[PDB]
Symmetry: C4
Subunit: 479 residues, 4 copies
């Protein structure tokens, strides 16, 4: 072009040649490199306290299983059930016994709670609740049973005695009515003070676990799976100043620098997008003032650089992350999962920002941009393969999921089928069927035809096209 | 052609251009898309009740193992055997004890049965039966044992007492003759009322399990594998109307709509095949009335589009499915396995029907129809590879199957060999041999040569040709 | 050529065109197809009795472990050891106790033996033998221990009482000297009558197992691995005629037909090789009597057809197999392992004989003979890769084998490294190192560099060349 | 060139043609082949004694776990913890009991030690030490706990009585203060005489293990992982001459020959590098005395052959190895790990020296040197893929490592992610998430998106380029 060709060309040139010609020093360049190191150490420094929370929550859960389940070892979370009446009674009584004699037996430190919520009365702590049918008279031989699903909640409340008994039982009389039994649910919460947090030196981590011991009998199959689930609940409990002076200032000073580096890069990107709008206002130099080529103004949408849009997306996650971290570390906030996903995806997307920095010798972008050539065909190919995929996925879910371990949900089917097309647990899937060889042989004989067809189709007949697309894009890009 | 070129061409054109030119609105197009959603939700809605049946059957089996096997935990179904006389006695007596004291101990609800069948006399319920040799005098040292395989069936009948004993034992005297023992088989059936079926609200699921506890001693190897197998048997047992009004109408109204959608599509396909027969009656315009080209009438067989034939095949499975579902849900039918395979294969084949819908921009069919180009060569290549495959399959079955876990049947060999050529449990196969390194070292040394050769031949020397065929078809199709 | 061109060309033409032109009916063709079915059913019919022998031997071994090892369950063959003196004593005494009270407790039928061999005196049956040092005075604190490796064999003989005690102990006084102890070895043999062999109806299978219970203390590591090994020993023991009339004639009549079919094919191949020698006697028509081309007489070695040589090799295995089978089934022979390898390799090599039959449309041999084109380059490439392979194999054996499970022998290294280059147990190898992260961190840090380098080199940088060779041969063969 | 073209060309010619023309006999050639056999048998002969040390150390550790841990079986090293106060007490007392009654119970031979070090007083042997907080008053309900991390070390000393008690307890009074407990650490060392070393006949291996039984309670999670770690410590203890005459001379005579062969090859390589410097002194024949190509003197760096440089690097490891072996075998040195890595990498690098020998028919180097062509592009491609890799690696470490087994450290993440891109434990990673489906569903839903994206990106979209680079180099090299 005549007038603005210099500015047109200068926008798309590489940073070295752009810096060699005109403008200012590459301050934008360094802050991106600094961002990568700043956010990754932030990510890890968050990670130290992150896993400290999860290990504490989980190990407490593991500890609760070895107190309030009679005969549970570390192994068989599933396949831990009652098969006998007195044995289930013993399971239920063991939980209550160990709840009553908790501070005697336990290694940690678990304070009880008085009943504020709905499963508890004003005073109670442990509260085992029989979900059982309102109407019921089951007897397989003779007629008339008369059942309707109305769950009556027989809750038996009990709270423990403290170490000094004031001078100023019940659950031993418990009967379940096993023919009418939907389940038994032992609810109790335990407050604790997490003393693991003295590596980063934030002692105020006063947890409250919510133990749900569930004797689940939704099957009525003579087998009542016994399980123990915990919900945490975290806030402070009065202890300021003991050995906390530096870390409160340092970690505060670190994340504000992350915020500074991310905001400074976000501003410099905002300036880069600000340039984007002006070019659109040129309208391809009004067709060079010649009305030439008959331009359709669709490529004008694809014109603007996406790497900046990705960079901004990653920034938002970083800066949203750091405010979540300042909150969760030094204030009333409590959700590590969200902050971890945020800072993690932020670092994932930031580290791939180096690819943007890699445009030297005009040879990296031959290897990188083959995906930009392929993606059109890969998208179109992926549809038809996914179409077949969902067929096997929906088929194997309902047909094989009843009889087998790996297909119990569409998630697991979509995991298993995906692990199949690369080849892991490919024999184990067929090995699940060896139990079904002498029971529902049509399901066994179907599953062979299913698994052979599925992986023969995708590992050979379909993957090869996907390799041929990506290698075929590499064949075109190198010319 | 002159006259029917328009109709000739109009048949093979895509639905968009076909609709743009002449004919009617695309009602056929929408009903195929509706079919996909209608049949998949049908499939899943069947799936809810499907796994409810399998979980109930299986968990009851698991419950029976923990009652009627002395020392069985969830783990080691195989490798659960008696090794000692009194221990086997205890195993046999434990089953009978737990049968006698079943409604006391059990968590579920199991009603007994009176002896109608052949292993039971008129009154009996539990019936342990010694299969033992008629003639036998085995004694490895001294001469003359005189054995012939005539199994004498010493059955000891016993039925339990109900909770009210009328005012108006034996099996404790049991002796097996272990040198002559073929096996001991404890048969008993238990009736139950499946109360798990109140999610879909069909309470009438009155099962009758047939427990076969088998002390299998066909080996005479001082180890008698103890196992427990169950056959279900399902029908109703008198309870109409309690909370069943809507679901009886809704699920009935859903599958008839599936039948309507499948039949309407089947009719519209019948109209599409009806057009097929007319072209055949043209006979390639009697060679354009010129006798030109010398047409052989083989391509005339390949002329007609198969996607309709696949669509009809999938319809049949859907409509046969839904009538099986209406039957099994509402009215005395009982085979979930068949209906699941039917509706599942129906949905598998229906979902791949979207590929037929995908013919836009003339680019999907470049990726899809490479298989139609390749299949000629892939079929011809597959024969020679399968020929070699069966060699290793028949060889490894008889040679390695005695000594190892993965080759105990041609099915498992064909699974293992197939998992090998992609690479799963490839080390575990060699790891099975490490026991055989100090016993039958020729079998070990053979198996190395077998497994190396087999996977070196197929993963490298043979797979590469299959990749080259499919990629080679992709090389030809894109021109 | 002039005279013998017809015979020259007629030799190499396909069987269809060869039969169309001149000669006789294709009797050679059918007998090869018949051979495949005849030898495979032979193979399987041998296989029925083959695994019957192995299952009996192994299950008896499993039974011996559950009698003569105190606390052994099915699981942990390795990692079953004594750690305490009295516990080892109990282990040793349990074996002897259970040997003394064998026919009381056992389920099978085990007759004892009187001492003919070298570990037994004239009369003894069980004989526990302490291998311990002649000189020894070990005491880590103080000086002078004076040890030389001369194993003194303190054998304590004991044989059991029969059910009638004649009117006309010791091992309870046993002391091991654990500081001087090399091991304790309990030897005893048990005769049995294998009654599993009444499916094929050959009752005379009178086994004699040789139980070696070894308390191996070659380590002196405060842990003495307890293991039990068995050698079988099989011949008849006087019982002719009870229900044996047909099977003795049928199986005899089957293998002689296999011998007939193999010998007839071997003769017809001998006739095909007989033609081979005549052509050599033509000497390429003495250069057409023109001295043309300057022929070097190396291609004359490759001239003669190899498929016949393979066919003869496979025949020899079949016919050597069948005579081994006639022997082992109906005579004093006893080695299933050799016959299984023989008939198995025979069937493996026979089934690949169909490839020879597949030369139709001149298109199978384009897919098959690409290996004949590639093998020159594949051999040359394989050397350099194997050269690197043995480097990692010898390195990982001595360096990683001490610390890890998968590298304990060059066999296992060569299995593991080979399973690595396709990708199975690739994470488990790295997972073995996680124990060594806090002990010998240089070995851990070496093993990372080893396993990364090894599989990065072979899965990517080396396999790709092997794929490129085989695909590159396919690129050349199709022209 | 005119004058030195002969010497220029003669340097780069193959050994056969170089030997055919001028110079001396190929003594260099044979000694390289001899080196391969000499160093590999050295490597293995070292390996015999190498694993003898590791097996002894490890099996002793295994033995210590079965003495000084109450209820530990071989299985669950992790997931072996105390959950109850008295149970932990019993765990602690069991170690001390078994320490006091060690020579009674044990199978080996463990002499005690008197307290020289810092955890022991002048006389003590066993010394259990409570790491507990100086200040502490934790009580989740009520206010004011006042904790500072100052670990007070309450060590309770106790040494055992010898077999003669002289005519001229405490730890039973032990109390932990479990609310203030950081951990309990039982330290004791055991001297032993390794009698396993009489295969190579070096009896003087007098070990001293340092048992650290750690009741680690850094979590305060009501679960105190119990573990047992051992550090060895090896030197001689007075026993010269019993049956040691030959092996002392033979193994000495073997490694000096290795040193001779390596030094002779190192000298001959020094002569090969000596030739390298002369060519540099020619300065590309002063531009052929024509000033022609304007040569940049970078290719001047590349001229000297790398395989020689690698050969000398591998020599250094061999000769450093052998002196370490002479030392560790026949002198006061003690580090098998370093010598194993040294001789192992030496043999790894020596065996790949055969590739250097393989330059015959000018066809091996077409297959080998494709990596020298590819490495430029492979390096450049590897950067961008590693950039993405570290994104997933740092992301999955902190996000998934808390909740899962395979991501607990960046090492394990880098192992797991690498095993993913070939496809092993690809389903097991997704199977770890099935616990997290009902707890932190955002982490579960993130991990799906993570694992799908990561392996879909690398197994398909990225690996294909790496295959295309290596196959693309093979495409260029064959022309
Ligand atoms: C793995 C990547 C490449 C490609 C085309 C091979 N491909 C499939 O083969 C089928 N397929 C799914 O339908 C799908 C859905 C959710 C997770 C993973 C997958 C999955 O593996 C697919 C389909 C959808 C999205 C991504 C992909
Ligand atoms: C897996 C697909 C592709 C191909 C050619 C690689 N291929 C084999 O390599 C050998 N092969 C069998 O003989 C075979 C038989 C039954 C189930 C699976 C297989 C199996 O993997 C084969 C052979 C027959 C039918 C399908 C296939
Ligand atoms: C597996 C086949 C193909 C090829 C070239 C990839 N290849 C290797 O990569 C290295 N390699 C051995 O050194 C080797 C030795 C013994 C068993 C298996 C192998 C083994 O996998 C090799 C080497 C020798 C013989 C066969 C092969
Ligand atoms: C495995 C080889 C080939 C290649 C390019 C596929 N590649 C990766 O895909 C990513 N990658 C790492 O970042 C990496 C770092 C440390 C060990 C293993 C790996 C690893 O697999 C990589 C990256 C660095 C060094 C070697 C490699």
């Amino acid at each position: 072009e005549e007038d603005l060709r210099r500015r047109l060309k200068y926008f798309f040139m590489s940073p070295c040649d752009k810096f060699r010609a005109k403008g200012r020093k590459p301050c934008k360049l360094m802050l991106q490199v600094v961002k990568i190191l700043v956010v990754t150490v932030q990510l890890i420094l968050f990670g130290l306290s992150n896993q400290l929370a999860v290990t504490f929550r989980e190990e407490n859960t593991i500890a609760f299983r070895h107190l309030f389940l009679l005969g549970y070892s570390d192994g068989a979370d599933d396949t831990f059930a009652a098969y006998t009446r007195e044995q289930l009674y013993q399971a239920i009584f063991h939980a209550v016994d160990q709840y009553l004699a908790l501070p005697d037996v336990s290694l940690g430190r678990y304070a009880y709670v008085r009943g504020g919520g709905d499963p508890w009365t004003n005073g109670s702590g442990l509260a085992l609740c029989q979900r059982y049918y309102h109407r019921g008279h089951v007897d397989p031989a003779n007629d008339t049973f008369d059942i309707d699903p109305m769950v009556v909640t027989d809750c038996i409340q009990v709270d423990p005695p403290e170490r000094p008994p004031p001078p100023p039982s019940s659950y031993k009389n418990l009967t379940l009515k096993f023919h009418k039994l939907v389940n038994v649910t032992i609810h109790f919460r335990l407050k604790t003070i997490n003393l693991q947090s003295l590596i980063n030196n934030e002692i105020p981590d006063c947890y409250t676990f919510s133990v749900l011991i569930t004797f689940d009998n939704k099957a009525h199959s003579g087998r009542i799976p016994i399980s123990l689930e915990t919900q945490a609940h975290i806030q402070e409990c009065k202890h300021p100043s003991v050995f906390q002076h530096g870390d409160n200032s340092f970690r505060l000073l670190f994340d504000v620098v992350v915020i500074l580096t991310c905001s400074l890069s976000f501003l410099l990107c905002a300036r880069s997008l600000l340039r984007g709008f002006l070019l659109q206002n040129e309208f391809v130099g009004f067709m060079w003032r010649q009305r030439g080529r008959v331009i359709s103004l669709w490529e004008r949408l694809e014109f603007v650089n996406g790497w900046y849009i990705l960079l901004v997306t990653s920034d938002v996650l970083t800066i949203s992350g750091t405010i979540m971290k300042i909150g969760i570390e030094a204030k009333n906030l409590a959700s590590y999962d969200v902050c971890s996903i945020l800072l993690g995806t932020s670092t994932l997307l930031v580290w791939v920002g180096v690819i943007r920095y890699l445009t030297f010798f005009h040879n990296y972008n031959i290897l990188i941009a083959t995906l930009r050539v392929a993606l059109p065909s890969v998208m179109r190919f992926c549809c038809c393969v996914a179409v077949i995929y969902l067929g096997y996925c929906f088929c194997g879910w309902i047909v094989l999921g009843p009889y087998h371990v790996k297909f119990r949900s569409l998630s697991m089917v979509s995991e298993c089928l995906f692990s199949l097309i690369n080849g892991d647990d490919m024999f184990v899937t067929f090995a699940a069927m060896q139990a079904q060889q002498g029971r529902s042989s049509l399901v066994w004989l179907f599953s062979q035809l299913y698994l052979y067809s599925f992986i023969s189709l995708f590992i050979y007949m379909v993957l090869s096209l996907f390799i041929a697309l990506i290698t075929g894009a590499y064949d075109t890009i190198k010319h």
